């Protein structure tokens, strides 16, 4: 007769029509949806909020779980809700879904035994859903797991009885494992919401995963957000230039929570005839603002609702009944109050539970019980409990710690903490911060970023210049502007580093960085900077090749690797080069500085003051049409001494040049990685006359060419010179036989100065090993690696070469194959 799908279309129109869909919006107003605007959705590269379960560019395997993360504030469940709607309303998936089944994980216990009858508690009103129906059939529905990080309690990721059959009831948290890793209900599809610290518990039950950031608002956004939230525009161009003046704080409105913290406030100033103050700078600083406004008006019973807070915390409870709040002395006064300012919600959905608008705020409130004027008041236990998910990581706990112990403070709540216990939290945090600053170890604790928001917030240079002092090394990811202000403020306050690396991700080739630039320019600690593996684009060089012009630089190494760097960069980091005396070492590897840009580069490394000694340019498209420049180089820069031109097509016709200006005795040269560039036997001559002329070459490396015999031949006429000063020889698959043994032995035995031998995979043969055995007991001088490596021997030769590491130990390893 009548179908139900229908109906439950109406429901969900119905019900999800407001962003808090709660009570206590100051008055119990109805936010209406219609307010929402939209953030981005970046696949981990744009994508819609359709086409996120369709089959991609390849192999065209359809996606059953898609991933959305983003940190706290950013609007996860309000997109969630907003699918619920448009999907309702028809423009949503009207086609590939009949039913859409939201599930709030803040409401699902981990310790109940239940069957799958969230199917049922998600339906309409009416009790008796036909559940065997359509309603079963396996590809037309889709869960919406929201909140996955706001599971209360242990989460046991590793179980047995996975608990198929919808209808068998089983514990909460098996139920949710089976329907993540499929084993419940194969085929249907399931968005989860999670904070990116939380993938740590589900990367193990997602297996196959779309994964997709979500992003906060645009300058353009944030302004929007005013002027819709503020019905009058004459008021809402004030509120928007309040904030736009304080950088700060505008860079900060990026996450929709903060700019909404800030948008209540201000309101409530409008309202009251108030000059609409806000100087916030620091995350802390904006929630004491709002509750200081908020309470001060209450605050009578502070230290029962920061118990309140602090108890949710500790023992996993973020739904409070009547009962909770009777037994903290909250009830039938001041719990009205703040259901009044929106501080507090009733949830007043078809139940009788109580929470706080936002965890923020819940943590917020337990981190000052700990400083007020009861599971434990004890700072150590807490931050020995911080890299855990049973009890909710604590990292706004600990973050607005270090926020509310400072010493400039003012009246309205801050004032209500007391001295001697934040003169003890401020020295168990330094504490804190020494020893995982130290400990440089893959984790979950801070991981060198999470220490600079702490830092940050924390505004006391006599503190952090002192904290910093326990970071020699800095190793950080920036993505977004927030990573930016507060690294910037960090590493600014820092006198003791000695190497930097920054991993820029998908916000250069912009100015985004230059402000962290600029800070790093003025170091006089710096000495290695590593700005490797990331999209530098020339835009992004030219900025770096000013900065490194300052008089006060002092970067010594720098290291440029595959940055996707152009020939036009080369003009600016020339300049660099002939100005800047202090930088030694660059590796510009990787790049496509073709042959042009090394007809650049070249100028400034000919010219005076240029003191670069080790030079890396492999992998740069070079042909032999560079190698006249490049000679020109050996020649004239005395200072120049390591030169790794490998992977490249410098043949035997370009070798030729760099050896005929190698070969003259003033060449400083002393290693040369000739490795990959496809030279043959034919060359070898040319190798050979600079190893008996040149005596400063000390290392040379051929591996990847192909000699063969000859070109073995040749390179021992040169080897065995009286004047020949090379140690190491390295030739790994140089396509050698046999009847190249005779001259390897020669090298042995009459080599004075060869250390090290790298013979390696070629078919250099068991008997040919056998003969080197016997000759490298006769006074060998070489005491390093003979190779012969990836090759492999029968049992006979491998003995040999067992006893002959027994019987002379003056060789360092012999390196046998097994
Ligand atoms: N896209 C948006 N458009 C308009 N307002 C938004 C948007 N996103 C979030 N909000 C603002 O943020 C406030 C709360 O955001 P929200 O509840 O989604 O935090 P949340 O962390 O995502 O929730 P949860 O605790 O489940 O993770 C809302 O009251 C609203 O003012
Ligand atoms: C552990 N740590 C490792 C290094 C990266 C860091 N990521 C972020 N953390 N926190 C917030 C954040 C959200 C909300 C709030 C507010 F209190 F206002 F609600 C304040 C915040 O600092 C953000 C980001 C990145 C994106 C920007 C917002 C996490």
Same mark, same amino acid.
């Given at each position: 007769?009548?179908?139900?799908?229908?109906?439950?279309?109406?429901?969900?129109?119905?019900?999800f029509?407001?962003?808090?869909?709660?009570?206590?919006?100051?008055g119990?107003?109805?936010?209406?949806?219609?307010?929402?605007?939209?953030?981005?959705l970046?696949?981990?590269?744009?994508?819609?909020?359709?086409?996120?379960?369709?089959?991609d560019?390849?192999?065209?395997?359809?996606?059953?779980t898609?991933?959305?993360?983003?940190?706290?504030?950013?609007?996860?469940?309000?997109?969630?809700?907003?699918?619920?709607?448009?999907?309702?309303?028809?423009?949503?998936?009207?086609?590939?879904?009949?039913?859409?089944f939201?599930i709030?994980?803040?409401?699902?216990?981990?310790?109940?035994?239940?069957?799958?009858?969230?199917?049922?508690?998600?339906?309409?009103?009416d009790?008796?859903?036909?559940?065997?129906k359509?309603?079963?059939?396996?590809?037309?529905?889709?869960?919406?797991?929201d909140?996955?990080?706001?599971?209360?309690?242990?989460?046991?990721?590793?179980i047995?009885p996975?608990?198929?059959?919808?209808?068998?009831?089983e514990?909460?948290?098996?139920?949710?494992?089976?329907?993540?890793?499929?084993?419940?209900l194969?085929?249907?599809?399931?968005?989860? !919401?999670?904070?990116?610290?939380?993938?740590?518990?589900?990367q193990?039950?997602?297996?196959?995963?779309?994964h997709?950031?979500?992003?906060?608002?645009?300058?353009?956004?944030?302004?929007?957000?005013?002027?819709?939230?503020?019905?009058d525009?004459?008021?809402?161009?004030?509120?928007?230039?309040?904030? $736009?003046?304080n950088?700060?704080?505008?860079?900060?409105?990026?996450?929709?929570?903060?700019?909404?913290?800030?948008?209540?406030?201000?309101?409530?100033?409008?309202?009251?005839?108030?000059?609409?103050?806000?100087?916030?700078?620091?995350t802390t600083?904006?929630?004491?603002?709002?509750?200081?406004?908020?309470?001060?008006?209450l605050?009578?019973?502070?230290?029962g609702? @920061?118990?309140?807070?602090?108890?949710?915390?500790?023992?996993?409870?973020?739904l409070f009944?009547?009962?909770?709040?009777?037994?903290?002395?909250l009830?039938?006064?001041?719990?009205?109050?703040?259901?009044?300012?929106?501080?507090?919600?009733?949830?007043?959905?078809?139940?009788?539970?109580?929470?706080?608008?936002?965890?923020?705020?819940?943590?917020?409130?337990?981190?000052?019980?700990?400083?007020l004027?009861?599971?434990?008041?004890?700072?150590?236990?807490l931050?020995?409990?911080?890299?855990?998910?049973?009890?909710?990581?604590?990292?706004?706990?600990?973050?607005?710690?270090?926020?509310?112990?400072?010493?400039?403070?003012?009246?309205?709540?801050?004032?209500?903490?007391?001295?001697?216990?934040?003169?003890?939290?401020?020295?168990?945090?330094?504490?804190?911060?020494?020893?995982?600053?130290?400990?440089?170890?893959?984790?979950?604790?801070?991981?060198?970023?999470?220490?600079?928001?702490?830092?940050?917030?924390?505004?006391?240079?006599?503190?952090?210049?002192?904290?910093?002092?326990?970071?020699?090394?800095?190793?950080?990811?920036?993505?977004?502007?927030?990573?930016?202000?507060?690294?910037s403020?960090?590493?600014?306050?820092?006198?003791r580093?000695?190497?930097l690396?920054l991993?820029?991700?998908?916000?250069?080739?912009?100015?985004? @960085?230059?402000?962290?630039?600029?800070?790093?320019? !003025?170091?006089?600690?710096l !000495?290695?900077?590593?700005?490797?593996?990331?999209?530098?684009?020339?835009?992004?060089?030219?900025?770096?090749?000013?900065?490194?012009?300052?008089?006060?630089?002092?970067?010594?190494?720098?290291?440029?690797?595959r940055?996707?760097?152009?020939?036009?960069?080369?003009?600016?980091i020339?300049?660099?080069?002939?100005?800047?005396?202090?930088?030694?070492?660059?590796?510009?590897?990787?790049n496509?500085?073709?042959?042009?840009?090394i007809?650049?580069?070249?100028?400034?490394?000919?010219?005076?003051?240029?003191?670069?000694?080790?030079?890396?340019?492999?992998?740069?498209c070079?042909?032999?049409?560079?190698? $006249?420049?490049?000679?020109?180089?050996?020649?004239?820069?005395?200072?120049l001494?390591?030169?790794?031109?490998?992977?490249?097509?410098?043949?035997?016709?370009?070798?030729?040049?760099?050896?005929?200006?190698?070969?003259?005795?003033?060449?400083?040269?002393?290693?040369?990685?000739?490795?990959?560039?496809?030279?043959?036997?034919?060359?070898?001559?040319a190798?050979?006359?600079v190893?008996?002329?040149?005596?400063?070459?000390?290392?040379?490396?051929?591996?990847g060419?192909?000699?063969?015999?000859?070109?073995?031949?040749?390179?021992?006429?040169?080897?065995?010179?009286?004047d020949?000063?090379?140690?190491?020889?390295?030739?790994?698959?140089?396509?050698?036989?046999?009847?190249?043994?005779?001259?390897?032995? !020669?090298?042995?035995?009459?080599? $004075?100065?060869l250390?090290k031998?790298?013979?390696?995979?070629?078919?250099?043969?068991?008997?040919?090993?056998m003969?080197?055995?016997?000759?490298?007991?006769?006074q060998?001088?070489?005491? $390093?690696?003979?190779?012969?490596?990836?090759?492999?021997?029968?049992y006979?030769?491998?003995?040999a070469?067992?006893?002959?590491?027994?019987?002379?130990?003056?060789?360092?390893?012999?390196?046998?194959?097994?």
């Amino acid at each position: 007769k009548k179908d139900y799908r229908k109906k439950y279309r109406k429901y969900v129109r119905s019900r999800f029509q407001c962003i808090e869909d709660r009570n206590a919006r100051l008055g119990e107003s109805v936010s209406l949806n219609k307010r929402y605007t939209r953030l981005r959705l970046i696949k981990e590269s744009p994508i819609k909020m359709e086409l996120l379960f369709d089959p991609d560019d390849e192999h065209s395997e359809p996606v059953h779980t898609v991933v959305f993360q983003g940190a706290a504030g950013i609007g996860k469940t309000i997109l969630a809700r907003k699918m619920m709607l448009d999907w309702a309303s028809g423009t949503l998936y009207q086609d590939r879904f009949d039913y859409l089944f939201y599930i709030h994980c803040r409401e699902v216990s981990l310790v109940t035994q239940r069957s799958l009858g969230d199917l049922i508690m998600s339906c309409c009103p009416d009790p008796n859903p036909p559940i065997h129906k359509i309603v079963r059939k396996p590809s037309r529905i889709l869960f919406l797991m929201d909140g996955f990080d706001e599971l209360q309690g242990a989460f046991d990721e590793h179980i047995g009885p996975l608990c198929t059959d919808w209808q068998k009831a089983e514990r909460g948290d098996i139920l949710l494992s089976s329907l993540i890793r499929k084993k419940l209900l194969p085929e249907a599809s399931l968005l989860i !919401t999670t904070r990116p610290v939380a993938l740590e518990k589900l990367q193990h039950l997602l297996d196959h995963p779309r994964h997709v950031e979500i992003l906060g608002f645009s300058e353009a956004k944030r302004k929007e957000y005013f002027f819709k939230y503020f019905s009058d525009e004459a008021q809402a161009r004030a509120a928007f230039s309040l904030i $736009q003046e304080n950088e700060v704080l505008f860079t900060m409105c990026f996450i929709p929570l903060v700019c909404w913290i800030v948008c209540t406030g201000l309101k409530q100033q409008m309202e009251s005839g108030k000059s609409l103050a806000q100087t916030s700078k620091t995350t802390t600083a904006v929630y004491v603002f709002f509750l200081s406004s908020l309470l001060q008006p209450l605050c009578a019973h502070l230290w029962g609702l @920061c118990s309140l807070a602090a108890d949710g915390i500790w023992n996993q409870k973020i739904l409070f009944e009547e009962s909770d709040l009777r037994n903290h002395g909250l009830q039938k006064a001041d719990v009205s109050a703040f259901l009044r300012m929106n501080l507090f919600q009733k949830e007043v959905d078809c139940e009788k539970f109580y929470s706080f608008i936002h965890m923020t705020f819940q943590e917020f409130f337990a981190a000052m019980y700990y400083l007020l004027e009861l599971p434990s008041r004890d700072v150590t236990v807490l931050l020995e409990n911080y890299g855990k998910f049973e009890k909710g990581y604590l990292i706004f706990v600990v973050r607005f710690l270090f926020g509310l112990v400072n010493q400039e403070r003012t009246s309205y709540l801050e004032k209500k903490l007391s001295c001697k216990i934040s003169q003890q939290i401020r020295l168990e945090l330094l504490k804190w911060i020494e020893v995982k600053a130290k400990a440089k170890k893959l984790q979950i604790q801070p991981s060198q970023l999470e220490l600079f928001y702490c830092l940050y917030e924390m505004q006391e240079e006599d503190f952090v210049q002192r904290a910093m002092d326990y970071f020699p090394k800095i190793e950080i990811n920036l993505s977004t502007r927030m990573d930016h202000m507060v690294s910037s403020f960090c590493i600014e306050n820092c006198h003791r580093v000695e190497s930097l690396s920054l991993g820029f991700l998908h916000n250069l080739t912009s100015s985004f @960085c230059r402000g962290l630039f600029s800070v790093l320019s !003025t170091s006089q600690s710096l !000495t290695e900077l590593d700005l490797s593996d990331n999209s530098l684009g020339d835009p992004g060089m030219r900025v770096l090749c000013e900065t490194l012009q300052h008089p006060g630089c002092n970067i010594r190494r720098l290291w440029l690797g595959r940055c996707g760097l152009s020939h036009e960069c080369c003009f600016d980091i020339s300049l660099v080069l002939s100005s800047n005396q202090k930088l030694v070492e660059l590796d510009l590897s990787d790049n496509a500085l073709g042959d042009f840009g090394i007809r650049l580069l070249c100028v400034g490394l000919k010219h005076l003051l240029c003191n670069l000694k080790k030079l890396w340019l492999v992998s740069c498209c070079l042909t032999s049409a560079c190698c $006249q420049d490049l000679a020109s180089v050996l020649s004239t820069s005395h200072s120049l001494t390591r030169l790794y031109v490998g992977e490249n097509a410098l043949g035997d016709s370009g070798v030729a040049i760099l050896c005929e200006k190698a070969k003259n005795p003033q060449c400083n040269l002393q290693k040369l990685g000739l490795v990959n560039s496809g030279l043959t036997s034919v060359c070898c001559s040319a190798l050979s006359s600079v190893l008996s002329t040149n005596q400063n070459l000390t290392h040379l490396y051929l591996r990847g060419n192909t000699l063969g015999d000859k070109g073995i031949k040749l390179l021992c006429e040169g080897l065995l010179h009286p004047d020949c000063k090379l140690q190491v020889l390295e030739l790994d698959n140089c396509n050698l036989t046999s009847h190249c043994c005779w001259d390897l032995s !020669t090298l042995l035995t009459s080599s $004075q100065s060869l250390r090290k031998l790298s013979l390696g995979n070629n078919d250099l043969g068991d008997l040919g090993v056998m003969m080197f055995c016997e000759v490298l007991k006769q006074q060998s001088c070489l005491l $390093q690696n003979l190779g012969l490596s990836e090759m492999y021997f029968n049992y006979e030769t491998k003995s040999a070469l067992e006893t002959l590491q027994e019987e002379k130990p003056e060789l360092t390893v012999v390196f046998e194959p097994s």
